Every structure is written in C-alpha cells, then in structure tokens.
Design a binder for this molecule. Structure first.
Ligand SMILES: C[C@@H](CO)Nc1ncc(Cl)cc1F
Length: 119
C-alpha cells in the first residue's frame, strides 16, 4: 500500500528498457535531419530520455501519466512507419510488449495503494 513505490519501480523499468538494444531508436528525440517530414505526421514527439527526465524532475504525479508518455513513443512509431514490417517499428512492438508486461503490476499496486488510502 505504498503510494510512492511506483516511482522507483518506473526508474528500474526505464533502466531495463535502456539496457535493451530494441530501445536505441527511442532513447532520444527522433532526428529531424534523418526524417525531415517527421513533424508533418507526428504532433507530439516523445522518447525515453524525456520520460526519464520528467520522472526524475518530479513532474509525473502517477504511473498512469508515465505510461501515457511511454505509449505515445510506441503510437508515434506506428503512425510514422511506412510499413508494419519496418525495422524500427518492429523494435517498438517488442519494447511495447516488454513494457506492458512490467508496467501492469506497477499500475495495479499504485491504484490498490490509492484505494487503500481512501478506504
Ligand atoms: C530484462 C531482460 C533480461 O534479459 N529481458 C528483456 N529486457 C528488455 C526487453 Cl525489451 C525484452 C526482454 F526480454
């Protein structure tokens, strides 16, 4: 029932994501010199360094907010991909599955802790 536990759990999950090779295209903002039309398709860029920095600055109030930004990294990759078979998009699907598998307990524990707080 620790209402604050999600933060370190998210830091550790981001550490695992950064250790994974599949995260390399998503660790920093998409390079507009490499993909000059990126902002014509993507309205809200997002990357794992921005998520980590937001978390470390104390600018997420809940793990749901962090989860919304991580999911935006994946939806941007899906919206920008020219093919559902593309390399970068394929890496995003594996990273997404790993992220969802691990964030589920973080979200559950946080929501359970908040319900206990308001019992
Ligand atoms: C924790 C690590 C242990 O080797 N396994 C993984 N880490 C990251 C991804 Cl995206 C997929 C994995 F299977």
């Amino acid at each position: 029932y620790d209402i604050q536990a999600w933060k370190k759990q998210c830091e550790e999950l981001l550490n695992l994501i950064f250790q994974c090779e599949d995260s390399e295209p998503f660790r920093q903002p998409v390079d507009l010199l490499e993909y000059p039309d990126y902002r014509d398709i993507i309205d809200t860029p997002m990357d794992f360094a921005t998520v980590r920095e937001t978390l470390e600055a104390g600018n997420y109030e809940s793990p749901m907010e962090l989860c919304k930004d991580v999911r935006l990294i994946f939806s941007n990759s899906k919206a920008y991909t020219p093919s559902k078979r593309s390399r970068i998009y394929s890496m995003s699907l594996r990273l997404s599955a790993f992220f969802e598998e691990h964030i589920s307990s973080v979200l559950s524990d946080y929501k359970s802790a908040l319900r206990f707080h308001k019992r």
